Design an enzyme around this catalytic site. Structure first.
Site, PDB file in Angstrom:
ATOM      1  N   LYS C 151       0.857  -1.180   0.000  1.00  0.00           N
ATOM      2  CA  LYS C 151       0.000   0.000   0.000  1.00  0.00           C
ATOM      3  C   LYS C 151       0.901   1.239   0.000  1.00  0.00           C
ATOM      4  CE  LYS C 151      -4.493  -1.045   0.214  1.00  0.00           C
ATOM      5  NZ  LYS C 151      -5.430  -0.196   1.029  1.00  0.00           N
ATOM      6  N   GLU C 206      -2.349  -1.098  -8.724  1.00  0.00           N
ATOM      7  CA  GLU C 206      -3.781  -0.985  -8.454  1.00  0.00           C
ATOM      8  C   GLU C 206      -4.291   0.436  -8.237  1.00  0.00           C
ATOM      9  OE1 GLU C 206      -5.082  -3.580  -5.291  1.00  0.00           O
ATOM     10  OE2 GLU C 206      -7.103  -2.730  -5.228  1.00  0.00           O
ATOM     11  N   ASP C 231      -9.848  -0.821  -9.359  1.00  0.00           N
ATOM     12  CA  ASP C 231     -10.614  -1.191  -8.169  1.00  0.00           C
ATOM     13  C   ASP C 231     -11.846  -0.292  -8.090  1.00  0.00           C
ATOM     14  OD1 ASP C 231     -11.708  -2.016  -5.803  1.00  0.00           O
ATOM     15  OD2 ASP C 231     -10.052  -1.393  -4.506  1.00  0.00           O
ATOM     16  N   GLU C 308      -6.770 -11.711  -2.650  1.00  0.00           N
ATOM     17  CA  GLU C 308      -6.262 -11.034  -1.458  1.00  0.00           C
ATOM     18  C   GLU C 308      -7.233 -11.309  -0.307  1.00  0.00           C
ATOM     19  OE1 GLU C 308      -6.267  -6.846  -2.628  1.00  0.00           O
ATOM     20  OE2 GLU C 308      -8.445  -6.765  -2.370  1.00  0.00           O
TER      21      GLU C 308
HETATM   22 MG   LIG Z   1      -9.245   0.445  -3.253  1.00  0.00          MG
END
Ligand SMILES: [Mg+2]
Ligand SMILES: [Mg+2]
Ligand SMILES: [Mg+2]
Ligand SMILES: [Mg+2]
Lengths: 355, 356, 354, 354
Positions: C151, C206, C231, C308
């Site tokens: 992240k 992502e 996403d 995930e």
């Molecule tokens: Mg997201």
């Protein structure tokens, strides 16, 4: 309640470290007055609006059109101005600025508050390196590093301008953000080669590399060059901002109150840009203190990814205000007193007035 | 001139119609000034994704603790904080933004319209909607008003029936009336093409959201081929949606609504995008009571609205939670110009109509 | 058999708190099914909060569904979407409960109801997000002793890039390294960042930009030299088609919560396949119930990018009697009737908020 | 439970002869399912003939599937498509038999295995294609004693337009009039013909131009003032997405034969729905087996344009024990386990080719 009862303007030539400023003083029926500034560079060599034509628009058209009208209705005043006067955004900017200054004084609020509130009261201000000598530029930028620099290029052969830039990047690049401004100088071919090289060397932003007469090229470059592109002359109003974005341009816009018609008018362009995912930059036409702080109040209300270039007053030996803005640590403090936060020094105003 | 938000209260109010559930908010500043706002929708979750209870929840559990203690006079700072911490929930945000503007208006002794740059017009047009489900009844009602603009709701019946219904009204309220229709997403692409062509042919001036917001592609195609104006509603909520649709090639007008954008100030960004793109403006509603309606009117007053407004929400209620209602007359509504929104909360009524 | 009753609870469970909205749907034939709708950080990451999800179920979905035939998922879905706009998280919990109950009634696991599982063991990557590079590398090294999701987007670009570069150099040799910017970057930052990421060897990026800028997402997918994973830009099959038609190339992060359930998400999956877009089993950090619900759906599809589904591994406790078995970078899919998990009533009431 | 055996016969039944390819699949648990793969005019309308369909089943699908788990449609489908390219007609028959058998094993009609029926009675139009206007009007008038599909394209344009015009005048006020050009018109004829058809009130124009010219079909769908129905231009979910992305607006003629079965066709349906494309229940003139197999799938979907499942009504005899019930412009969908139809052994053997 309150109307505009008088509008005065002067062409002032102040000494530079001469810059010509068109200053305006607007008096409302309630006794409160406000000031504004419309300045450009190089007479008619950089823009279609000259100091004398700006003065002319204010005196012969904007004054008689606005006298007697309610002074607080910004929307109504703007509609009237745009409905009766085509273009002349510099003149309009001075007037709009004076209206906001006066309204802020009448309410006891800084212009930024009139514009919805400041996100910050200290704004970043970069420095332009354009002494003509690479060695000097690096030296000047070095002392400031003891964080963002704008290099002016496009007046020499591509090879020389690139060597000049590369030298500055290698010397200052790891500690400062390096941006360049070609100010429309490159043809499409030179633009492609130049921009690829600038990107490859680490330049963070390339400003208006091609002519505003070739937005198609600007769009193409924004989609192919591996660094950010900043549109300047290619975008003045919200209409231009939408059009360029719709066309596929990606990058940032150099917001300037003079191109849009004022501190309030420029906000429409800002929001259109934001809606399209276009980044923002606080631009200047090298205004003195009045026009600079006016721009600052507007810039304070927006997230400016690329900072600002509001260093205009720092280029003057003297100005027409009683107290200048305070610059420090790559920043400028935004006044938060009623109106613009600066006042006209009548003695200096008269001294520097052209005629 | 400056103060912090000290408290935020909200109530779900069920008011009788000629019930409509309103989410009312009262924001109290540290200087003692209060501002009010309204977030209302239609039919629970049948028309939008935000229900009165979810809106109330957003205000109570998220917006309240996020805003208490923050300077209440800085709308830009508050908006950035709200959007940075809260995704969507524009209905809840609109109630809060309205209250914030109401309070700062009272603090400057200025109406919200003035805080938004000034009113271009202090009397705004308001059309009437014909949706009794009965052609005869609708014509009568419209006939009474013609003694000038009408919005007909369709899309609940077979195309042939809805078209005959609209044609009848067009013939009856002919010459002296602008006829607009709202299909509110009901038609599939094929039905929409046929329906829109017929509507344009019979003289309908505007067709609102003929197809689903799931098919903006169809909306764009229709706007480019149909021989009358198309009004986008569900397809456009925020300035972001506004830019995207325009860039895609949509031509016509946008139904501005404070609830969809996040408030009287937030909706102005969408309006400017529309103006920059050559798209017309319309003052839309979610059938708000007096608070939400006047909040919308203050914003609408600052803009050139080619298609007028549909701010008749208060006229559908037998009672409201304000002390004094807005004055409607001759197809128009008067915009208050006193400090703030220009309307005050009637606590006795507020408590009487509060759900719980 | 009709839906006789629907119950929902907001449950706050301890993490290594996460708020789950648990649903129990009771059929007229005595069979019950459970479901879950969970999100991250209240309203910070999505428009649906735990309390708004609870409200949607209690005030709208329950009265809408009570009395309706419980075995007709197509009819139930049409009724739900016809009367309820959005609120996909609430719908997902309901659809999950309907499937769980249905599977029990037929003695079949949810995957079988969805046409059959292609595999009963699904790959599950691990997310490195301690905010500390040294810690992340250490943690990943402990697992290699083979896919990691990093992240980024909460710090200056140069910092996040250096952070990701250090992880790629240390774990990249034997593990697929993906990153998730979760809408953090503006267009300009996104272009520079994505190019840098691709250059250093990141396998998948992502949602680099905002869902407000699908134009940028499309542009990046066509110019960046590595895979892009959408996403927030894609929730339903409608979004999936639109984005694909626009020119987006890469993969979609399928999530039952975004689509409206284990069955509803399959429509998005098929649209993606038809368009040549890759698939990924996404999560909203669901507990065991929502995680296995997603798993049954994922089992029926070819997932090029894996899954995930590690949400339960972040909890100190859950509201189920028996948890899923995680091992060797995989998770075992139960094949008993329904979801294959049961509600632990004592814990449910223990962790219930009200 | 595995697939123990697969049998197939080419059956020639008399019309009012039609060649059907019938399949019988027997599972290891003794349960059996039947399917049907049928076409029109040998190789004049499709690339798959009855003999080629039989061959694919006998020489390829049979050895490929025998021994495989019979309840995992997804796994079986991946196996079938991985090993066999095209041959959707043969796959449709096998897929149908698998579903029929699975339904009997679970005590559910195929529609329920497909998620549930939105309706148990479906609209069925009648095709007028005698080649004579008078005969078409007579037949149409007799049926009105609700929707008709007129076949045209085999004669001069002015001849076909006058033909359709007469039919619209005679039956147009009491029924939906659609035409099917079945790829016969060149682009210029199509533009002129479609404009005339739209102006006279035709509700739907099916495949006016060649499938070799989807570009023309798209152009027409965007300029013609009536709905366009794509048939040969769309078979699979891939085709459906491609045509939609290209800009086509109208409806798709779904057919299990083109997609590979009652389940496989659903992916195409979902892509269409995602793109805003309307749906129509198509046929290859299947007998009772193939027709009811289609009906089960159609029942789970909102079909704006209805269906054309009148295949059985064109036969003097079929190979089923009990035929479907057609009445009031509709057909009843059986709701007993599986397809709801049984194979009539004697009739089967009697009509088997050789
Ligand atoms: Mg997201
Ligand atoms: Mg320039
Ligand atoms: Mg609407
Ligand atoms: Mg055909």
């Amino acid at each position: 309640t309150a109307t505009v009862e008088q509008i005065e303007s002067w062409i002032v030539d102040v000494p530079t470290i001469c810059q010509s400023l068109v200053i305006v003083r607007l008096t409302r029926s309630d006794g409160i007055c406000g000031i504004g500034e419309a300045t450009t560079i190089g007479g008619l060599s950089y823009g279609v609006e000259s100091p004398e034509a700006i003065s002319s628009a204010i005196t012969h058209y904007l004054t008689p059109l606005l006298k007697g009208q309610p002074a607080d209705n910004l929307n109504a005043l703007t509609a009237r101005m745009n409905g009766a006067i085509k273009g002349n955004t510099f003149a309009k900017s001075a007037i709009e600025t004076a209206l906001l200054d006066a309204q802020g004084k009448a309410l006891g609020l800084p212009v930024s508050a009139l514009l919805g509130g400041a996100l910050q009261t200290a704004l970043p201000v970069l420095w332009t390196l354009a002494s003509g000598d690479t060695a000097k530029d690096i030296a000047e930028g070095e002392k400031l590093l003891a964080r963002a620099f704008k290099l002016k290029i496009g007046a020499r052969e591509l090879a020389t301008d690139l060597r000049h830039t590369r030298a500055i990047v290698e010397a200052l690049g790891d500690r400062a953000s390096i941006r360049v401004d070609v100010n429309q100088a490159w043809d499409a071919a030179t633009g492609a080669k130049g921009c690829r090289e600038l990107a490859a060397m680490g330049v963070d932003l390339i400003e208006q590399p091609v002519s505003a007469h070739d937005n198609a090229a600007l769009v193409r470059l924004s989609q192919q060059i591996e660094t950010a592109i900043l549109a300047d002359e290619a975008v003045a109003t919200a209409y231009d901002g939408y059009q360029l974005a719709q066309q596929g341009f990606t990058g940032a816009y150099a917001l300037k109150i003079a191109k849009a018609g004022g501190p309030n008018s420029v906000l429409a362009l800002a929001r259109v840009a934001q809606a399209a995912g276009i980044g923002l930059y606080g631009g200047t036409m090298l205004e003195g203190t009045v026009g600079t702080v006016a721009s600052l109040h507007a810039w304070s209300t927006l997230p400016l990814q690329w900072g600002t270039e509001m260093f205009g007053p720092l280029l003057l030996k003297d100005d027409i205000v009683s107290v200048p803005l305070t610059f420090a640590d790559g920043q400028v403090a935004l006044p938060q007193t009623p109106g613009l936060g600066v006042e006209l020094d009548e003695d200096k105003l008269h001294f520097y007035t052209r005629q």
